[PDB]
Amino acid sequence: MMPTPVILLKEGTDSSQGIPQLVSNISACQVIAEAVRTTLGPRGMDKLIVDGRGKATISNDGATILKLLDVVHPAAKTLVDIAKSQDAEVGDGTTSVTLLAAEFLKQVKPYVEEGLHPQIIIRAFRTATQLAVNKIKEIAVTVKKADKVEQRKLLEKCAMTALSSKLISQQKAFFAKMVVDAVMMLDDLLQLKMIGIKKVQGGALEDSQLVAGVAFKKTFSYAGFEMQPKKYHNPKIALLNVELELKAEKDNAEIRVHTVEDYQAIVDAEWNILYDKLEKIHHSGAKVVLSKLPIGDVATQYFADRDMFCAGRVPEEDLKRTMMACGGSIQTSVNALSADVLGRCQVFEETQIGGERYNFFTGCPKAKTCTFILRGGAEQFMEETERSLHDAIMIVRRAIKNDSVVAGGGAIEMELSKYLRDYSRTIPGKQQLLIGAYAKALEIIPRQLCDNAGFDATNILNKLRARHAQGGTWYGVDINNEDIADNFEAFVWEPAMVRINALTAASEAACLIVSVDETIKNPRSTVD
Amino acid sequence: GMNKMVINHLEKLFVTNDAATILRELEVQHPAAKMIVMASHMQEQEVGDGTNFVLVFAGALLELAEELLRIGLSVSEVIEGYEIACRKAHEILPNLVC
Amino acid sequence: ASMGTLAFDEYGRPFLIIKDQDRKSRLMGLEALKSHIMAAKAVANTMRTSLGPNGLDKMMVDKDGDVTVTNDGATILSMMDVDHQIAKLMVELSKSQDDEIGDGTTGVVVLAGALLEEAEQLLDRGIHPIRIADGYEQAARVAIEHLDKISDSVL
Amino acid sequence: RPVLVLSQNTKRESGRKVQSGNINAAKTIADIIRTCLGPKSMMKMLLDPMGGIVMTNDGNAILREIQVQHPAAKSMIEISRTQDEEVGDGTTSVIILAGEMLSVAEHFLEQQMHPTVVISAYRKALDDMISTLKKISIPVDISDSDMMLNIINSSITTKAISRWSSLACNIALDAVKMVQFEENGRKEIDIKKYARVEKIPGGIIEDSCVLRGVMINKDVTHPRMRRYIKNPRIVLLDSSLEYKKGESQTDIEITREEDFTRILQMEEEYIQQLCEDIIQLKPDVVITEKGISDLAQHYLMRANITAIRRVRKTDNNRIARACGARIVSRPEELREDDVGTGAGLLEIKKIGDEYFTFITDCKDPKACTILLRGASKEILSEVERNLQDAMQVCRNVLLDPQLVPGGGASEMAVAHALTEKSKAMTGVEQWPYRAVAQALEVIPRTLIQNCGASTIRLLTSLRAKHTQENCETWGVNGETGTLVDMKELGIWEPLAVKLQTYKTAVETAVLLLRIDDIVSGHKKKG
Amino acid sequence: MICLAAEYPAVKFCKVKSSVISSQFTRNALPALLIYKGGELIGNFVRVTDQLGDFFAVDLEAFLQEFGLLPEKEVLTSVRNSATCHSEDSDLEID
Amino acid sequence: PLSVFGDRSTGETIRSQNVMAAASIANIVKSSLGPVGLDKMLVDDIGDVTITNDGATILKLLEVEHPAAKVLCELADLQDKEVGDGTTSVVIIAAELLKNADELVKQKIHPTSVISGYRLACKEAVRYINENLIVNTDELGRDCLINAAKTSMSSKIIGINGDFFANMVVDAVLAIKYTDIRGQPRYPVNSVNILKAHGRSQMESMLISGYALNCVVGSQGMPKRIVNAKIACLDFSLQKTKMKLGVQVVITDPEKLDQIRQRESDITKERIQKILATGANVILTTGGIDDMCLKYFVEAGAMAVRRVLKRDLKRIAKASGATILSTLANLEGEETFEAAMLGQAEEVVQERICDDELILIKNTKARTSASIILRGANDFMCDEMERSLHDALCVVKRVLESKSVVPGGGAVEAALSIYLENYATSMGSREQLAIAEFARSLLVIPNTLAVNAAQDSTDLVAKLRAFHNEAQVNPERKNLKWIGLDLSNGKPRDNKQAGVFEPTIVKVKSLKFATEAAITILRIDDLIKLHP
Numbered sequence A: 001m002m003p004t005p006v007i008l009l010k011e012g013t014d015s016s017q018g019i020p021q022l023v024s025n026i027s028a029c030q031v032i033a034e035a036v037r038t039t040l041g042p043r044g045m046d047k048l049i050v051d052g053r054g055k056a057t058i059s060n061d062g063a064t065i066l067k068l069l070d071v072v073h074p075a076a077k078t079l080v081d082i083a084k085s086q087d088a089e090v091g092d093g094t095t096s097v098t099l100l101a102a103e104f105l106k107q108v109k110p111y112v113e114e115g116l117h118p119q120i121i122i123r124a125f126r127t128a129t130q131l132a133v134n135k136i137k138e139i140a141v142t143v144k145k146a147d148k149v150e151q152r153k154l155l156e157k158c159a160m161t162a163l164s165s166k167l168i169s170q171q172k173a174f175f176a177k178m179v180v181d182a183v184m185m186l187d188d189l190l191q192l193k194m195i196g197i198k199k200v201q202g203g204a205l206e207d208s209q210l211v212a213g214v215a216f217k218k219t220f221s222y223a224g225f226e227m228q229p230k231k232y233h234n235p236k237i238a239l240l241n242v243e244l245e246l247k248a249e250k251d252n253a254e255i256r257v258h259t260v261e262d263y264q265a266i267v268d269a270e271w272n273i274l275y276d277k278l279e280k281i282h283h284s285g286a287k288v289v290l291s292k293l294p295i296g297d298v299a300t301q302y303f304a305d306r307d308m309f310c311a312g313r314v315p316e317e318d319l320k321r322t323m324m325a326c327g328g329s330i331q332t333s334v335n336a337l338s339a340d341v342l343g344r345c346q347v348f349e350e351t352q353i354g355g356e357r358y359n360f361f362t363g364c365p366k367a368k369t370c371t372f373i374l375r376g377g378a379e380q381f382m383e384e385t386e387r388s389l390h391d392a393i394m395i396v397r398r399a400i401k402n403d404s405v406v407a408g409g410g411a412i413e414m415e416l417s418k419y420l421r422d423y424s425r426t427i428p429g430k431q432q433l434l435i436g437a438y439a440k441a442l443e444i445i446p447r448q449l450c451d452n453a454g455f456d457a458t459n460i461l462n463k464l465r466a467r468h469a470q471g472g473t474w475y476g477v478d479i480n481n482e483d484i485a486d487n488f489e490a491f492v493w494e495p496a497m498v499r500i501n502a503l504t505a506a507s508e509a510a511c512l513i514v515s516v517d518e519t520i521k522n523p524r525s526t527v528d
Numbered sequence B: 001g002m003n004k005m006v007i008n009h010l011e012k013l014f015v016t017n018d019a020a021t022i023l024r025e026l027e028v029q030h031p032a033a034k035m036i037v038m039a040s041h042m043q044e045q046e047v048g049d050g051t052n053f054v055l056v057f058a059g060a061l062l063e064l065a066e067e068l069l070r071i072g073l074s075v076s077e078v079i080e081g082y083e084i085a086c087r088k089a090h091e092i093l094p095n096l097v098c
Numbered sequence C: 001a002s003m004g005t006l007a008f009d010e011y012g013r014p015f016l017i018i019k020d021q022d023r024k025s026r027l028m029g030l031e032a033l034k035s036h037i038m039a040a041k042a043v044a045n046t047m048r049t050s051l052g053p054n055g056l057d058k059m060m061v062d063k064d065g066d067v068t069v070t071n072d073g074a075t076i077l078s079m080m081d082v083d084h085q086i087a088k089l090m091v092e093l094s095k096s097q098d099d100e101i102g103d104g105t106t107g108v109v110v111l112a113g114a115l116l117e118e119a120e121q122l123l124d125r126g127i128h129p130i131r132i133a134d135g136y137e138q139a140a141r142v143a144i145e146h147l148d149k150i151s152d153s154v155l
Numbered sequence D: 001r002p003v004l005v006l007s008q009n010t011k012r013e014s015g016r017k018v019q020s021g022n023i024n025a026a027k028t029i030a031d032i033i034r035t036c037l038g039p040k041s042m043m044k045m046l047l048d049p050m051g052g053i054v055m056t057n058d059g060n061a062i063l064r065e066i067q068v069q070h071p072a073a074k075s076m077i078e079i080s081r082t083q084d085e086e087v088g089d090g091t092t093s094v095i096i097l098a099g100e101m102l103s104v105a106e107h108f109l110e111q112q113m114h115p116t117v118v119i120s121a122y123r124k125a126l127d128d129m130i131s132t133l134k135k136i137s138i139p140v141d142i143s144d145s146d147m148m149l150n151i152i153n154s155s156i157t158t159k160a161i162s163r164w165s166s167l168a169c170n171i172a173l174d175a176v177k178m179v180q181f182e183e184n185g186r187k188e189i190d191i192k193k194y195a196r197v198e199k200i201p202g203g204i205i206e207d208s209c210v211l212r213g214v215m216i217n218k219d220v221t222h223p224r225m226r227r228y229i230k231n232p233r234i235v236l237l238d239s240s241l242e243y244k245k246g247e248s249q250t251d252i253e254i255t256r257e258e259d260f261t262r263i264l265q266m267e268e269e270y271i272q273q274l275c276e277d278i279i280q281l282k283p284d285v286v287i288t289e290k291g292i293s294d295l296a297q298h299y300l301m302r303a304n305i306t307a308i309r310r311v312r313k314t315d316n317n318r319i320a321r322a323c324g325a326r327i328v329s330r331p332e333e334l335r336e337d338d339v340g341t342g343a344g345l346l347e348i349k350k351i352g353d354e355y356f357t358f359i360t361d362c363k364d365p366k367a368c369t370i371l372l373r374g375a376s377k378e379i380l381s382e383v384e385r386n387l388q389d390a391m392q393v394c395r396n397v398l399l400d401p402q403l404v405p406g407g408g409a410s411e412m413a414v415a416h417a418l419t420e421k422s423k424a425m426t427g428v429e430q431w432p433y434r435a436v437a438q439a440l441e442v443i444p445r446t447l448i449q450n451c452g453a454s455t456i457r458l459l460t461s462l463r464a465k466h467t468q469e470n471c472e473t474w475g476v477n478g479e480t481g482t483l484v485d486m487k488e489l490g491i492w493e494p495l496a497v498k499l500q501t502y503k504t505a506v507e508t509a510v511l512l513l514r515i516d517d518i519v520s521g522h523k524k525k526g
Numbered sequence E: 001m002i003c004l005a006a007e008y009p010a011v012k013f014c015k016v017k018s019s020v021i022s023s024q025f026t027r028n029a030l031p032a033l034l035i036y037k038g039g040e041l042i043g044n045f046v047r048v049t050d051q052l053g054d055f056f057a058v059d060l061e062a063f064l065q066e067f068g069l070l071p072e073k074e075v076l077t078s079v080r081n082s083a084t085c086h087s088e089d090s091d092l093e094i095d
Numbered sequence F: 001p002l003s004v005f006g007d008r009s010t011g012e013t014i015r016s017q018n019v020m021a022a023a024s025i026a027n028i029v030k031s032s033l034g035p036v037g038l039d040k041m042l043v044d045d046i047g048d049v050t051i052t053n054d055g056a057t058i059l060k061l062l063e064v065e066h067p068a069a070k071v072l073c074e075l076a077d078l079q080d081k082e083v084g085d086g087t088t089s090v091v092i093i094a095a096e097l098l099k100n101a102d103e104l105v106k107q108k109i110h111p112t113s114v115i116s117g118y119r120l121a122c123k124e125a126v127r128y129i130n131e132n133l134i135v136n137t138d139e140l141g142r143d144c145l146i147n148a149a150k151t152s153m154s155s156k157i158i159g160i161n162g163d164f165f166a167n168m169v170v171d172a173v174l175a176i177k178y179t180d181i182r183g184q185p186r187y188p189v190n191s192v193n194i195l196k197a198h199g200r201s202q203m204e205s206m207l208i209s210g211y212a213l214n215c216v217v218g219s220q221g222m223p224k225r226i227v228n229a230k231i232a233c234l235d236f237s238l239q240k241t242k243m244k245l246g247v248q249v250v251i252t253d254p255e256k257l258d259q260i261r262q263r264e265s266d267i268t269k270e271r272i273q274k275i276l277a278t279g280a281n282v283i284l285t286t287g288g289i290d291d292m293c294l295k296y297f298v299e300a301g302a303m304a305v306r307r308v309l310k311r312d313l314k315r316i317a318k319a320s321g322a323t324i325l326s327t328l329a330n331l332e333g334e335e336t337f338e339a340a341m342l343g344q345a346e347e348v349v350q351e352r353i354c355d356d357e358l359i360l361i362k363n364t365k366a367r368t369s370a371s372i373i374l375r376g377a378n379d380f381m382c383d384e385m386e387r388s389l390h391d392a393l394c395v396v397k398r399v400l401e402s403k404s405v406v407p408g409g410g411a412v413e414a415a416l417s418i419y420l421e422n423y424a425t426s427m428g429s430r431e432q433l434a435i436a437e438f439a440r441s442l443l444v445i446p447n448t449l450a451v452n453a454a455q456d457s458t459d460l461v462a463k464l465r466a467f468h469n470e471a472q473v474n475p476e477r478k479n480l481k482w483i484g485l486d487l488s489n490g491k492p493r494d495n496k497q498a499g500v501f502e503p504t505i506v507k508v509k510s511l512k513f514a515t516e517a518a519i520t521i522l523r524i525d526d527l528i529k530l531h532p
């Protein structure tokens, strides 16, 4: 190095190039993977992360844990990004992607240290991943008769398998049945905004319920609200986007009068406008009035005098769910309130749930939405319950799209590893080592399962390898008996697309990391 | 060619093997290198590919010009020789179309 | 074990993974469970003296000097200035019991502290914490059924 | 919690960057003194850290006065010092050659050639270089004074002393010839110890001469002593001529009245006995490396003897060599053979405002002093450096009587021979061989650049001429910038100097090519 | 000091700025020749410019030697001789 | 709860940290292995520069903080002390062993099983080396020593210079040969004085048929060349006699002071006369000589050298047959010196070496000694030449002491890896894995050798393993055990045919030391770092 009186790049630029930087990138990926290892499997554990503000997040979800981590390593951010991608596309397997990518990099690291050209490793990864995806699609079990009973059983089993790693795994059957029931009621797009998630503190997990309709928290009742009846047996619901208050007609409106008679006429005209809106609402036959905009005390007392229910400032999502459940239409004007634009539910009731008042719309026969009311002893408890239910909902939706399942517990990966090793033993030998390394790296998930459960990983892996070699496809890790068992017969079912996406994303991340040979870091601007 | 992870002044990753992208994400301070970078960017704007070719050819030409200056040639003679050779290459190139 | 892993690479080059990783801390494995059990035990032992007819009140002082004398466990834990995350979890548990029922907000903390205290000596003997949680859930189901059995109705 | 493997201050650098940095540092070190080569070189002013000024064009002095941080630059400085110590000439040439070879090595290192191949090619090339240099050499009759003077002149035409060429050549030749010695079958020259250079600012440079003897900056101890003795008999001593304490603790115990006076009288009597022992040899001059007592001065003047005290040991050895005396420590053991007869005149004269002692008419003296008169201290220092170069070249010629054509003719001849030899290699290492062969052209190229002529045309013409059959002596005229024959111009240099330059340059390139990793900042751990 | 270090290799001449190590010491008290021997101050010389000037190596050498602080002064080897020092298994014959 | 004032690391964290430290130390010197290796240039932050390839020197010069890395550094130092060669190989092997053992441990294999497997693998590797991979030097002759020296001096600054330096080293080693009791030829290296001096090229390095002293005569009046030297070795200073602490001179009669002062020097004068009366020509003393005795020796036309090093004086006395005399005192209570105490040499000359002078004692009688004068371009190159020459001398000493050599170029490593991979299947179930990982770890040396040459390491090592597997399986093709790596062309080559040899003790000691270092580091699962 020489002073170079006129330096080329800006002062403070950091550059790392060659094999050492690739090894450092691999080590960083290993470090990132190590942070989420113990969260995988029914014997997994949760991680607690505290931000600068002092708030704590407790999660078993790999994507959430990685996001809460403030990763700044350029190569390590790839694992976080592929975890986010797996979460977005599938919703489950956010830990498997990171473990698989890190294990790929770990397996190919010794060849990197030996001076092997990265392009060869990338080609081997691409070939192995294509073969593995083809094998997954080939051996995935599907039934082409599609009856309601067996479809329900498959959905419930997939939901239980996706749920048997979280803190609600004790009530996994209950939660999975409830999640499948909620999902089956969505119409054609399976929109997540049509499934409500209400978290109410206090109460056990078994106290959580699914509403065959819509339910939302009471919204800032005005004076005179407590005189309105709080139960109806065949109400008609008027969904409005209207401000029912005494207010200026328009922001730029101005009234100019020069006689006291006109003054009184103007005051009475404002009152008559409000009362005309209220009378138009009342004459429609509706008994429950919900508005997106504030409802004043005058309107509240007017509706109370008519034995009618009012609720203003209802959020957008709650009104949308109410429209999709009862079957009305949101009206910005009350001039044409026909029976077509009026909702209908069998029973409306306001009850108390753990110190909160909730309005319930039940008995809807043709509802296309649902609302989850989750009970728990803590804020993060309910948050992680919601995350687990979201994972289960995503899995159930994907199963609805295509019921192609593979046995979990590492059985699918053992089959893939055996197939890949058999393929690799029949090629010249430069690609054979790398494909064998890929197959060996595919063993990470069952080994991690055994390690988390406290087993002896080596013996279980040996038994699994021997069983797969001698015949058997769905033999995986049996956590309860500390042994191996037929996971397909044990109903440890996974959608095939979960493993397909996991392998694809892990391979792409590994190829991207290997392809980089030089990293350059520009000096910071506006450090402050 | 191998991808390069380039981080600019705003913590933005740029992993790519595009020469123009790498140069524009690099804080180049030397003004002669600035001329060569502007030439590469002009090549990118006019055509769309060949920025790495432009940079490599310019670097090789400048090293060989340094060698020629060291052995005794003057700057003007080297410049005239490069101009004549560039004209000859432009004349030759159409005959190489396959 | 603490603060994470600091290697600075095996080639001498800088090894930065997480922003401000030198200023962050990390507890890994069984010692985290021991610390959490210890914190919960401390909170429960503080609460246990205010249980029953002969319980004694705690005399809370807020940041402004205002004085509150109370026996309500939920109120005491709400006004308690804690920093440990498990202590905050205990406070949230008391608030949950207050919201759902309104009574017994002190018994929940004592019961949780006793459960974690027993789980400590269960962990010391080489039992996976998930197994302890599953056994606790089974015993809780048994206790709930027994309560339903021995319950009595009033007019 | 700064857990680390190595120390915090340890810095490690490796790869292509280290090689590029080392080669660039060597190149820039060469570029520092590139312009100080040839008869048309320019002076450089060096500001010494201790406030002095060093004005010179010698490569070794300029490089020594420079402080550097890059270890490759330190290696180049050590190379220059080694070249100066071994032969005394060719420092600039060896630095430039090392830089050029490292440049042509970097050219290959940019490709995928391992440095070991380049080093092996360099070693083979160096062997062929030595062979060709020995081949194109010519013998010299050392008894021919004109040839020796011409060799010294060719050595000193590139220095500031070239304005006075005959005088400097005669001074150097006389000093080297009369410092030559042979005892017990062993031959020596010993320019370092004897043949002292004494510079007195003032006067004119044409007054500089080498004396047939020694000259010191000393005066008589007592003014009554003679300052001009015709044929002195000189006696040299180390022991003081004064009463000194014994080695052991020797406390006296006086209890009588006359013991104190007796002790003082015996001190005087011991001084008298030493003086009588010295006088017994009947000398004329007594020289001592230590003090001479006043009573000793009186007793010596009683015998008409000039005494000089506090002379440096090197000066006393030079006097002993010049006047044929033997240094004696005990006057009671003074033999006749120890008396120095052979000095033909001793004279104390004042130069400027300071007395100087001259013993300058010795017959067959084996040591001498070179009295330099000049304009100032810096000019005299440069003149002394040039005289040192001339004496080193004369000694090299006397020890090794082969000569090699100068003016870049040898460089071009060796380059052509190696290029012709490389045609039959038919291997992968032929390219570095030819490159390091052609790197020898940097010497004629630098000569032409300093002269101011056109480099490319002159190098092309010289190469074309050297492609002929008898043209190994065709080089570059340093003044007119024209192609001439060094058997006509007369510029010839010792084979030893060229051999040392070539070996040192090639081995410096080999040493610097071997490094590919740098770690620094660690404690000395002494 | 640089010149003195050549003839006195035993001494350990070192330099350090005042900033890295008071205000009154920085304004007009920078030149200090701190002499440390045995871990304690033997020479505490300050304001040395008054008795030195603004002086060559001879002046500083004399000033330090007049107080008996400079160690007593004591050939040029080729480069080096030693390579190690241990039980080097000197020559034997045995008959 | 511990309340220990310090930091504690437990479990996988400390194991990974130790492996990181060992791997970093290995990577420091991994680039200076084999002939295609390149040197490193160290700076001591005070301007001192050291260019070297020796692993021990590099690891000693560096300052290391982590203790697991200090273990490897002192392991390299121990390997240098007990063998003299293979200093980088042992460090690399130990680091690779630690890395693979840590991988096994992270795979939930108990460290005790890994250590037992490592011990078994080391024992069986040593046995296999001794029983299958040794070549006797009796049927090879001087060519074996020359080839061993050349192989040792590869990867050093005297590589291509090997054709000359190997002859020089072999002659120097054979010159100092002696046989002790039991008739065992013992070669006492470090008795070859290595003198360095910049100047002429490396080809001009001179091997002295005698001894070389880095000192000159004390007085310019003495002759600088004595033909028939009679060396007198002394261990006392020749100065003016001074009484000891227990003797004090007190004068009451003033007439005795002159006699006292005269005797103070007459004692030394009489000693000098007694020494010179036996015909002594060269006088060597460890102490100093004042000007008076220097003049005494000048008048006699004899050598006199002061401040001679003790080891140099002992070597000179042993070679020339002289006897060290710390004092002049016989068993009769007198003070005498006899001619039987005088050593003899065929010539003593003060020669000039690059503006400096040194004393050459040529052709000592009754015993032959040797010294080497290394000529280089600067101080750093001379130092590196000295280090490489010491390595070559140690290698030649090992080869001449134990007459077994092993093929070079990683052939031994590949053969051991194949044999141990085959052998692991016959022992245990988890120590099986430990032995397999030991075999895999032994492959790091050829991999590094191939990588340093910018060759395809994977293909070359695969071909080497195939050759050795064929040699081990087929019992009619056992000549392939000598197939190693030819880094010049990047092809497998019969190294025994090519003349690439190493002493067997190098491999054995390196394996044993690396195994112990790996076992020592692997035993740690917790670290407590007390705050100072």
Ligand SMILES: Nc1ncnc2c1ncn2[C@@H]1O[C@H](COP(=O)(O)OP(=O)(O)O)[C@@H](O)[C@H]1O
Pocket (backbone or CB within 6 Å): A039, A040, A041, A042, A044, A060, A062, A092, A093, A094, A095, A096, A161, A162, A163, A164, A165, A408, A409, A410, A445, A449, A477, A478, A479, A492
């Ligand atoms: N009952 C079970 N038995 C064995 N393995 C299971 C069981 N349930 C889930 N798994 C395994 O857990 C892994 C996924 O763990 P989990 O944390 O639920 O999701 P993620 O993949 O997002 O980490 C799957 O590979 C699956 O094989």
Ligand SMILES: Nc1ncnc2c1ncn2[C@@H]1O[C@H](COP(=O)(O)OP(=O)(O)O)[C@@H](O)[C@H]1O
Pocket (backbone or CB within 6 Å): D036, D037, D038, D039, D041, D058, D059, D089, D090, D091, D092, D093, D094, D154, D155, D157, D158, D405, D406, D407, D408, D409, D443, D447, D476, D477, D478, D479, D491
């Ligand atoms: N009269 C001359 N004409 C042409 N070249 C000369 C003449 N005298 C000397 N030279 C060249 O100049 C070089 C000597 O340059 P010099 O300044 O002495 O460098 P250095 O001090 O390193 O020897 C020699 O190579 C010689 O060939």
Ligand SMILES: Nc1ncnc2c1ncn2[C@@H]1O[C@H](COP(=O)(O)OP(=O)(O)O)[C@@H](O)[C@H]1O
Pocket (backbone or CB within 6 Å): F032, F033, F034, F035, F053, F054, F055, F084, F085, F086, F087, F088, F089, F090, F151, F152, F154, F155, F408, F409, F410, F445, F449, F485, F486, F487, F500, F502
């Ligand atoms: N000519 C050669 N050809 C192939 N391999 C060699 C040759 N010379 C040495 N080697 C190998 O290079 C390796 C490195 O040795 P080296 O690093 O010089 O020893 P040390 O480890 O003591 O520094 C040795 O194990 C040796 O087997």
Ligand SMILES: [Mg+2]
Pocket (backbone or CB within 6 Å): A092, A093, A162, A165, A391
């Ligand atoms: Mg999951």
Ligand SMILES: [Mg+2]
Pocket (backbone or CB within 6 Å): B049, B050
């Ligand atoms: Mg392109």
Ligand SMILES: [Mg+2]
Pocket (backbone or CB within 6 Å): C103, C104
């Ligand atoms: Mg109560």
Ligand SMILES: [Mg+2]
Pocket (backbone or CB within 6 Å): D089, D090, D155, D158, D389
């Ligand atoms: Mg010259």
Ligand SMILES: [Mg+2]
Pocket (backbone or CB within 6 Å): F085, F086, F087, F152, F391
């Ligand atoms: Mg070696």
